[PDB]
PDB file of C-alpha atoms and ligand atoms in Angstrom:
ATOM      1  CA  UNK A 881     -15.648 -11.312   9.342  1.00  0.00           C
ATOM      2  CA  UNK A 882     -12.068 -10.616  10.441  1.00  0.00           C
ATOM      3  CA  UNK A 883     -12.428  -7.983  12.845  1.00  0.00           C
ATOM      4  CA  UNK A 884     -15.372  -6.078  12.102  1.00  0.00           C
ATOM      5  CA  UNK A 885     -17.022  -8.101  14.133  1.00  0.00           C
ATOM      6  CA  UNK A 886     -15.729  -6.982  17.145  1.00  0.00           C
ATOM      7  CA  UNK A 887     -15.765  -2.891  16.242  1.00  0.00           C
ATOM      8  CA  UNK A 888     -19.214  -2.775  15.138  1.00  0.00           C
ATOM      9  CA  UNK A 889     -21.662  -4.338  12.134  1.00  0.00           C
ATOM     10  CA  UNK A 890     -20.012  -7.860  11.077  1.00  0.00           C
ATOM     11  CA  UNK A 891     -18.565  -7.878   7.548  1.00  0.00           C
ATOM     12  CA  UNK A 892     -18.151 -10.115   5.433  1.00  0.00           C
ATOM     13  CA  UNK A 893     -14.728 -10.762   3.815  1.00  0.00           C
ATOM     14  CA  UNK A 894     -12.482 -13.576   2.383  1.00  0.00           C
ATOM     15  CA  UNK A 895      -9.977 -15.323   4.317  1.00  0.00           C
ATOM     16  CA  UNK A 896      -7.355 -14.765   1.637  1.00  0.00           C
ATOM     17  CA  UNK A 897      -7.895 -10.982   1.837  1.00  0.00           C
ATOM     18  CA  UNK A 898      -8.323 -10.371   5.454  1.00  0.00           C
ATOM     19  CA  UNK A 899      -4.408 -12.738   5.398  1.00  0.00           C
ATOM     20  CA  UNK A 900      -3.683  -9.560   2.914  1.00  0.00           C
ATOM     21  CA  UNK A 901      -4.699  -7.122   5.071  1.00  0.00           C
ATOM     22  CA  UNK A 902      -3.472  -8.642   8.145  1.00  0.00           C
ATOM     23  CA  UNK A 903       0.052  -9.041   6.138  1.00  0.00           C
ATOM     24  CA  UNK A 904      -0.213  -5.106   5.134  1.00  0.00           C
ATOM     25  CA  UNK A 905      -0.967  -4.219   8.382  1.00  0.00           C
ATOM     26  CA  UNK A 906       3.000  -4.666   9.465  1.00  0.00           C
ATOM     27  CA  UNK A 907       4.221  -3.506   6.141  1.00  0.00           C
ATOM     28  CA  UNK A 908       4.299  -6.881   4.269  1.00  0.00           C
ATOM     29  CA  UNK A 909       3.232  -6.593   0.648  1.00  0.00           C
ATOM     30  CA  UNK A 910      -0.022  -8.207  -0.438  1.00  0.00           C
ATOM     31  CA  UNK A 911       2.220  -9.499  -3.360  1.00  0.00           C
ATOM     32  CA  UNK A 912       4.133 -12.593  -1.138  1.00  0.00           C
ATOM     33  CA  UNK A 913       0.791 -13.596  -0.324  1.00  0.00           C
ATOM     34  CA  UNK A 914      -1.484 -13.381  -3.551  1.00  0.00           C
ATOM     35  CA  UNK A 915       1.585 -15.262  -5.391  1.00  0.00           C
ATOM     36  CA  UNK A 916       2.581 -17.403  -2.375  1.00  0.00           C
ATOM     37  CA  UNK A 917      -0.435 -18.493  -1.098  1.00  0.00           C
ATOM     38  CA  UNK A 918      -0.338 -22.145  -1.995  1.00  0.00           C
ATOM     39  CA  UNK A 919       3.001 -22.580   0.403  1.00  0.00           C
ATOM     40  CA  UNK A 920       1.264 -20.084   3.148  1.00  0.00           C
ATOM     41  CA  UNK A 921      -1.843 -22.381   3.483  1.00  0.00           C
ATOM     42  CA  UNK A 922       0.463 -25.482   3.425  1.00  0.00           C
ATOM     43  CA  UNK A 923       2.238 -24.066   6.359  1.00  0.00           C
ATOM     44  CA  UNK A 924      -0.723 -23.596   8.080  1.00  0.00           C
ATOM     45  CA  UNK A 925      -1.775 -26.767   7.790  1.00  0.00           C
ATOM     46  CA  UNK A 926       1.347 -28.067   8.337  1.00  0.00           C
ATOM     47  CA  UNK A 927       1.347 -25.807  12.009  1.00  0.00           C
ATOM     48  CA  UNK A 928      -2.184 -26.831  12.765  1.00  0.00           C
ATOM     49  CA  UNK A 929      -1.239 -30.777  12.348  1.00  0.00           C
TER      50      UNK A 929
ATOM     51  CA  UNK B1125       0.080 -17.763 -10.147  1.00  0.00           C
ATOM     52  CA  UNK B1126      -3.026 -15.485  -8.487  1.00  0.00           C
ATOM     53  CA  UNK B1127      -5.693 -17.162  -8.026  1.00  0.00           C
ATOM     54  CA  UNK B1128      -9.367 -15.512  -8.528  1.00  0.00           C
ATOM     55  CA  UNK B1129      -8.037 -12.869 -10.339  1.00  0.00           C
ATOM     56  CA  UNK B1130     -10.064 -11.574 -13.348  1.00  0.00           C
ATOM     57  CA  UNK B1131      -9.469  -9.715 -16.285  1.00  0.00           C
ATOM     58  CA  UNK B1132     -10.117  -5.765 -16.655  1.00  0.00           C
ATOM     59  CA  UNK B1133      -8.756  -2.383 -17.776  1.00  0.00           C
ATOM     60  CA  UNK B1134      -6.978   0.101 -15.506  1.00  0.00           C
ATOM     61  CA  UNK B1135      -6.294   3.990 -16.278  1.00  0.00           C
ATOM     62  CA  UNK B1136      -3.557   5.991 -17.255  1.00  0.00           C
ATOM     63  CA  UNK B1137      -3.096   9.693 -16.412  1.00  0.00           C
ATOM     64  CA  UNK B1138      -0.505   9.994 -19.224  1.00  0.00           C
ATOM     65  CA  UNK B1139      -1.685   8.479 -22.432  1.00  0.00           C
ATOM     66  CA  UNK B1140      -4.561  11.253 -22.459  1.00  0.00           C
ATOM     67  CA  UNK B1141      -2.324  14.176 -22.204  1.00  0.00           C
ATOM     68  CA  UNK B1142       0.373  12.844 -24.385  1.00  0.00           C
ATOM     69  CA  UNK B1143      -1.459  11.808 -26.905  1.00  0.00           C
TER      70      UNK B1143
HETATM   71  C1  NAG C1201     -14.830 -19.656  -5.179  1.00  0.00           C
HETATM   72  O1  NAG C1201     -15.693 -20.564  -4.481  1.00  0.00           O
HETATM   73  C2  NAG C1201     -16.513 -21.365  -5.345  1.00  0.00           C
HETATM   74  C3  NAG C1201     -17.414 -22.186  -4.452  1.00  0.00           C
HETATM   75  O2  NAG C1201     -16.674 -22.842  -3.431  1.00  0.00           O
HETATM   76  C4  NAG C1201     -15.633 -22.218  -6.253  1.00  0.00           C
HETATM   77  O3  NAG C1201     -16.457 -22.949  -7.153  1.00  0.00           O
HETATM   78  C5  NAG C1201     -14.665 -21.336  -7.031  1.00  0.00           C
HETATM   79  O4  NAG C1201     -13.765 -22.144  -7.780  1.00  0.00           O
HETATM   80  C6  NAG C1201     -13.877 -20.441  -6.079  1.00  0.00           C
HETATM   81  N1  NAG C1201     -13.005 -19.546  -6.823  1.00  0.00           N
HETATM   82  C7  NAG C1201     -11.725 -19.826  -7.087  1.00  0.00           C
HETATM   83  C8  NAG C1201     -10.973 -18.790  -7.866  1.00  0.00           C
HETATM   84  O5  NAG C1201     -11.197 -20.869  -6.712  1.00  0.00           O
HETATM   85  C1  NAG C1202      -8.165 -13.594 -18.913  1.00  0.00           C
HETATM   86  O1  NAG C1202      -7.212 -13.497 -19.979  1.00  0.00           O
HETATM   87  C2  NAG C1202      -6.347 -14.637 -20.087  1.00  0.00           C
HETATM   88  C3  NAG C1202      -5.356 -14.329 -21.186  1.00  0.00           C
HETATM   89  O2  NAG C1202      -5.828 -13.294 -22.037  1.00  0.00           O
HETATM   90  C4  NAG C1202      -7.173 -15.891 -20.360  1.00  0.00           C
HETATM   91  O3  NAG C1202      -6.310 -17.022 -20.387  1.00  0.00           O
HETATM   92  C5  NAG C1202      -8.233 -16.071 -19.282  1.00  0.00           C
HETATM   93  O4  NAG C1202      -9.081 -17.165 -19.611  1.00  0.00           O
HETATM   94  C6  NAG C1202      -9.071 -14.802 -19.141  1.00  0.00           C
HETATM   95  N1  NAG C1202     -10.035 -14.944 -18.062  1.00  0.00           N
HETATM   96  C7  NAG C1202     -11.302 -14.529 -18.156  1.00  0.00           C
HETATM   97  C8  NAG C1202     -12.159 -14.755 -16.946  1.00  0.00           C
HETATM   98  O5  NAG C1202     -11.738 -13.994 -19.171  1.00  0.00           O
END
């Protein structure tokens, strides 16, 4: 859900666009991540390991 | 290199009026 889910009524909501919104939300273009999204997740992974 | 991106039309406010 995001955050909705804290604020109210849980919605429902792709990880790949709350990343977008979450990315937007501090003035990063959606672009770097619907383009870049292969290296994002490996980094991710990469962290979480 | 989007992925889950589909195909569709978008508008123009200038082709109308200029043409
Ligand atoms: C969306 O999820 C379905 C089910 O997991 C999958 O078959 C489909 O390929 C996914 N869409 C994309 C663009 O990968
Ligand atoms: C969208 O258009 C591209 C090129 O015209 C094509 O390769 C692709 O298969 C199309 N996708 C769909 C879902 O029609």
């Amino acid at each position: 859900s995001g955050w909705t889910f804290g604020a109210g009524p849980a919605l429902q909501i792709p990880f790949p666009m709350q990343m977008a919104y979450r990315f937007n939300g501090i003035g990063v273009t959606q672009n770097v991540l619907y383009e870049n999204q292969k290296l994002i997740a490996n980094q991710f992974n990469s962290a979480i390991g | 290199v989007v992925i889950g991106i589909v195909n569709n039309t978008v508008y123009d406010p200038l082709q109308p009026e200029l043409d």
